[PDB]
Design an enzyme around this catalytic site. Structure first.
Site, PDB file in Angstrom:
ATOM      1  N   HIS A 164       0.737  -1.032  -0.064  1.00 51.09           N
ATOM      2  CA  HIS A 164      -0.048   0.090   0.086  1.00 51.09           C
ATOM      3  C   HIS A 164       0.927   1.374  -0.197  1.00 51.09           C
ATOM      4  O   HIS A 164       1.962   1.323   0.316  1.00 51.09           O
ATOM      5  CB  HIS A 164      -0.962  -0.213   1.204  1.00 51.09           C
ATOM      6  CG  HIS A 164      -0.127  -0.049   2.444  1.00 51.09           C
ATOM      7  ND1 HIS A 164       0.190   1.442   3.064  1.00 51.09           N
ATOM      8  CD2 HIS A 164       0.227  -0.857   3.423  1.00 51.09           C
ATOM      9  CE1 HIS A 164       0.675   1.035   4.360  1.00 51.09           C
ATOM     10  NE2 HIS A 164       0.658   0.073   4.509  1.00 51.09           N
ATOM     11  N   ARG A 169      -5.367   0.280   5.629  1.00 49.67           N
ATOM     12  CA  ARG A 169      -4.679   0.896   4.351  1.00 49.67           C
ATOM     13  C   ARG A 169      -4.537  -0.088   3.249  1.00 49.67           C
ATOM     14  O   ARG A 169      -4.735   0.061   2.377  1.00 49.67           O
ATOM     15  CB  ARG A 169      -3.324   1.532   4.891  1.00 49.67           C
ATOM     16  CG  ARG A 169      -2.501   0.888   5.862  1.00 49.67           C
ATOM     17  CD  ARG A 169      -1.565   1.956   6.400  1.00 49.67           C
ATOM     18  NE  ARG A 169      -0.508   1.260   7.268  1.00 49.67           N
ATOM     19  CZ  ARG A 169      -0.532   0.856   8.418  1.00 49.67           C
ATOM     20  NH1 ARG A 169      -1.657   0.991   9.106  1.00 49.67           N
ATOM     21  NH2 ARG A 169       0.441   0.457   9.155  1.00 49.67           N
ATOM     22  N   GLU A 193       1.336  -4.730   9.452  1.00 48.06           N
ATOM     23  CA  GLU A 193       2.798  -3.994   9.408  1.00 48.06           C
ATOM     24  C   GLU A 193       3.430  -4.390  10.665  1.00 48.06           C
ATOM     25  O   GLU A 193       2.921  -4.699  11.606  1.00 48.06           O
ATOM     26  CB  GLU A 193       2.455  -2.340   9.481  1.00 48.06           C
ATOM     27  CG  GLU A 193       3.589  -1.554   9.445  1.00 48.06           C
ATOM     28  CD  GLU A 193       4.694  -1.645   8.246  1.00 48.06           C
ATOM     29  OE1 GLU A 193       5.447  -2.657   8.199  1.00 48.06           O
ATOM     30  OE2 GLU A 193       4.405  -0.877   7.253  1.00 48.06           O
ATOM     31  N   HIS A 227       2.014  -4.877   3.801  1.00 49.34           N
ATOM     32  CA  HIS A 227       2.733  -3.738   4.150  1.00 49.34           C
ATOM     33  C   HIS A 227       4.209  -4.055   4.002  1.00 49.34           C
ATOM     34  O   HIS A 227       4.719  -5.268   3.884  1.00 49.34           O
ATOM     35  CB  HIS A 227       2.572  -3.384   5.580  1.00 49.34           C
ATOM     36  CG  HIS A 227       0.941  -3.536   6.013  1.00 49.34           C
ATOM     37  ND1 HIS A 227       0.270  -2.249   6.096  1.00 49.34           N
ATOM     38  CD2 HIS A 227       0.309  -4.582   6.321  1.00 49.34           C
ATOM     39  CE1 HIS A 227      -1.066  -2.870   6.657  1.00 49.34           C
ATOM     40  NE2 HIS A 227      -0.988  -4.173   6.837  1.00 49.34           N
TER      41      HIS A 227
END
Ligand SMILES: O=C(O)c1c(O)cc(-c2ccc(Cl)cc2)cc1NS(=O)(=O)c1ccc(-c2ccccc2)cc1
Ligand SMILES: [Cl-]
Lengths: 233, 237
Positions: free
Chosen positions: A9, A60, A87, A184
């Site tokens: 992303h 996200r 993440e 991520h």
């Protein structure tokens, strides 16, 4: 010969991707949405098709995957969400910008953290504005005391990513399904490391581009038959 | 009460605008239908609803409704399960025709029979139909037995293939304590409502569920409604 696509992303809101967004569930900025649209377009132009999609529990990432699926008209694909793709968890640094981190902890310590593979940032303590937001979040209520991290080294992030890769994602690829992974930087790092058998120092040196299809071509044991290829113009 | 169930019916599609028969054609929402979903989700939000798992068809107007709701409530992280068994009713060879084309080709008598009937299917979608590859060849039904892929559906057919999913996959999860949210279509939701309420074929056909409005059920341990469905939203709506 299998095909595997990663996407990472792009930009999140309030400049958080330069503020150790970590496990804070920041949304995309309008830019980062745009970025994801472009990645989708790339995928559409190239005529790609997928059979399953894996993503984190952070929006996200999920919203990037949604944008891609829309762009390529496969909104009907099964989608599996796992925190194991989250993440990296930056503990007490989460939310701070480079200057605030240096002010708080000193440039020597920051450099050590920036250069270590096995050394975590300081834990997120209760006085941190994200402590309850993240640690009491409904979505992690099933995680045991040991799984829910207060902070991770890159080693830790990769360690909790790979078990999901092995146990869930590998089976589907072997069964010939065409996987898409939206996640991520650091979780995708861990995947890539187990793929290309890279060294700690090597993986710390790798920085995957955002909102860009990353195409891997694999043999029957899941080793890459050539370097990672990107997608666009 | 013991359990809570929430349904939502997607709203205006692109083809509703053209008043064409959609069925298993995968038409998107109009802007207005999307806005509807935003209102449904803002309602769900104001009430404070939380979910653990979501269900929907493999048709983007449902899926996008689901997405929009999940955005408005900040539960985008939830597990989501897609199934053809929640698809809109298959209108067979009527697909792609509009009111005028249907009436012109079939006459008032035939269309009245099809409208007021519970188990008379419309014509089959034959291989020369303009949307036959688009739907029957769509790779998303590849794992379907030849006897599962409808050429056309009565309302009875639709409910008959909807209810197996309910029974076998949603019920378990409700009895597990998992607050469910279903985003689907008028006719599949009809099937679910019929089972929940034990309604006669007459009553079910007369029932027209609002679009983009959360439909809440309060349920006892045996999945029996304890009171009549509720609509979520501001006073007027
Ligand atoms: O109430 C009505 O549906 C109706 C009606 O009873 C009669 C006439 C009519 C008047 C004059 C002439 Cl010359 C011809 C027909 C037109 C109508 N409306 S419709 O939109 O076209 C329509 C008709 C059928 C379905 C239908 C199809 C398959 C399964 C379930 C439902 C859906 C919409
Ligand atoms: Cl989804």
């Amino acid at each position: 010969a299998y095909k595997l696509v990663l996407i990472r992303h792009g930009e999140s809101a309030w400049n958080l991707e330069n503020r150790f967004s970590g496990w804070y569930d920041a949304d995309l900025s309008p830019a980062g949405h745009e970025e994801a649209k472009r990645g989708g377009q790339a995928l559409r132009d190239a005529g790609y098709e997928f059979d399953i999609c894996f993503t984190s529990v952070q929006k996200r990432a999920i919203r990037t995957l949604w944008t891609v699926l829309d762009a390529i008209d496969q909104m009907w694909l099964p989608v599996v969400r796992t925190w194991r793709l989250n993440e990296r968890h930056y503990g007490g640094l989460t939310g701070l910008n480079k200057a605030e981190t240096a002010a708080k902890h000193g440039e020597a310590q920051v450099k050590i953290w920036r250069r270590s593979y096995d050394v975590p940032p300081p834990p997120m303590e209760p006085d941190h504005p994200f402590y309850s937001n993240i640690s009491k979040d409904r979505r992690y209520a099933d995680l045991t005391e040991d799984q829910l991290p207060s902070c991770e080294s890159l080693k830790d992030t990769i360690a909790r990513a790979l078990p999901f890769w092995n146990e869930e994602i590998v089976p589907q690829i072997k069964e010939g399904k065409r996987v898409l992974i939206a996640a991520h930087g650091n979780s995708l790092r861990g995947i890539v490391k187990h793929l290309e058998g890279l060294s700690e120092e090597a993986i710390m040196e790798l920085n995957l581009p955002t909102g860009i299809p990353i195409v891997y071509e694999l043999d029957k044991n899941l080793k890459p038959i050539k370097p990672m290829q990107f997608l666009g113009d």
